Write an enzyme that holds these catalytic residues in place. Structure first.
Site, PDB file in Angstrom:
ATOM      1  N   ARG A  38      20.690  44.920   9.823  1.00  0.00           N
ATOM      2  CA  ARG A  38      19.963  43.460   9.979  1.00  0.00           C
ATOM      3  C   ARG A  38      20.143  42.957  11.132  1.00  0.00           C
ATOM      4  NH1 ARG A  38      19.576  38.147   6.678  1.00  0.00           N
ATOM      5  NH2 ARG A  38      21.623  37.056   7.147  1.00  0.00           N
ATOM      6  N   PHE A  82      20.713  34.720  16.054  1.00  0.00           N
ATOM      7  CA  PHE A  82      21.562  34.565  15.228  1.00  0.00           C
ATOM      8  C   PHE A  82      22.742  35.590  15.317  1.00  0.00           C
ATOM      9  CE2 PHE A  82      22.449  34.330  10.431  1.00  0.00           C
ATOM     10  CZ  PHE A  82      23.766  33.937  10.494  1.00  0.00           C
ATOM     11  N   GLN A 123      23.811  42.689  12.538  1.00  0.00           N
ATOM     12  CA  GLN A 123      24.789  42.949  11.271  1.00  0.00           C
ATOM     13  C   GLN A 123      24.827  44.494  11.112  1.00  0.00           C
ATOM     14  OE1 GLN A 123      24.590  40.787   7.842  1.00  0.00           O
ATOM     15  NE2 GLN A 123      26.080  42.228   6.860  1.00  0.00           N
ATOM     16  N   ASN A 174      31.150  39.494   4.551  1.00  0.00           N
ATOM     17  CA  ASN A 174      31.942  39.624   3.516  1.00  0.00           C
ATOM     18  C   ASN A 174      31.234  38.992   2.311  1.00  0.00           C
ATOM     19  OD1 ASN A 174      32.239  36.680   3.104  1.00  0.00           O
ATOM     20  ND2 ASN A 174      33.842  36.765   4.750  1.00  0.00           N
ATOM     21  N   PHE A 233      29.362  41.618  12.033  1.00  0.00           N
ATOM     22  CA  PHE A 233      28.355  41.137  12.883  1.00  0.00           C
ATOM     23  C   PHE A 233      28.562  40.847  14.328  1.00  0.00           C
ATOM     24  CE2 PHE A 233      28.939  36.511  12.178  1.00  0.00           C
ATOM     25  CZ  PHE A 233      29.922  36.644  11.044  1.00  0.00           C
ATOM     26  N   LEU A 258      30.066  29.251  10.301  1.00  0.00           N
ATOM     27  CA  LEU A 258      30.969  30.464   9.754  1.00  0.00           C
ATOM     28  C   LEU A 258      32.412  30.208   9.759  1.00  0.00           C
ATOM     29  CD1 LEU A 258      28.723  33.425  10.579  1.00  0.00           C
ATOM     30  CD2 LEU A 258      28.798  31.921   8.608  1.00  0.00           C
ATOM     31  N   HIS A 279      34.412  33.604   7.539  1.00  0.00           N
ATOM     32  CA  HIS A 279      34.396  34.851   8.221  1.00  0.00           C
ATOM     33  C   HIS A 279      35.591  35.104   9.126  1.00  0.00           C
ATOM     34  CE1 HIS A 279      30.635  35.687   6.147  1.00  0.00           C
ATOM     35  NE2 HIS A 279      30.573  34.389   6.450  1.00  0.00           N
TER      36      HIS A 279
END
Length: 164
Positions: free
Chosen positions: A54, A59, A62, A101, A112, A121, A125
């Site tokens: 991904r 952004f 991942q 997660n 990521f 986040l 995370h």
């Protein structure tokens, strides 16, 4: 004393370049060691040969799902999942390495690399590392991503290990 781990990245099998990361073994020891061991493969499994399933430009990228290659798999060295160690470190800009997660204390092997500041986040995370060399390679990876995350070509970890 903080370990440095390398990934060699390949796009459709063609070499692209090398990213190295520092792992904050001092600030998050249980998290960092999971990533380090998965990068050397010393426990018999790990990231070598796995993909970045991904990639959302602007952004993050991942990866780390080495058992189902699509975001539904992976496992830690400690077992299927392990706890959120702490949230001392924040998502302060591009190059931050953070755990993916599925809710509290569900870390496995997916991670990521942030390609932006991702402050929403923080506290959800666990941040555990940062790109040391090859941020330009990460930027090159980004251009194979898309708005929904699907990659236009296969982005794989062709090799990975510890540098120091």
């Amino acid at each position: 004393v903080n370990p440095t781990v390398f990934f060699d990245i390949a796009v459709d099998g063609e070499p692209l370049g090398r990213v190295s990361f520092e792992l904050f073994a001092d600030k998050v020891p249980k998290t960092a060691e999971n990533f380090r061991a998965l990068s050397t493969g010393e426990k018999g499994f790990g990231y070598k040969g796995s993909c970045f399933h991904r990639i959302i430009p602007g952004f993050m990228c991942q990866g780390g799902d080495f058992t189902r290659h699509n975001g539904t798999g992976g496992k830690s060295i400690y077992g299927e999942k392990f706890e959120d160690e702490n949230f001392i470190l924040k998502h302060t800009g591009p190059g931050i390495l953070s755990m993916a997660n599925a809710g509290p204390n569900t870390n496995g092997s997916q991670f990521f690399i942030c390609t932006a500041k991702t402050e929403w986040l923080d506290g959800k995370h666990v941040v555990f590392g940062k790109v040391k060399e090859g941020m330009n390679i990460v930027e090159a990876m980004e251009r194979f991503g898309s708005r929904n995350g699907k990659t236009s070509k296969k982005i794989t970890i062709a090799d990975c290990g510890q540098l120091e």
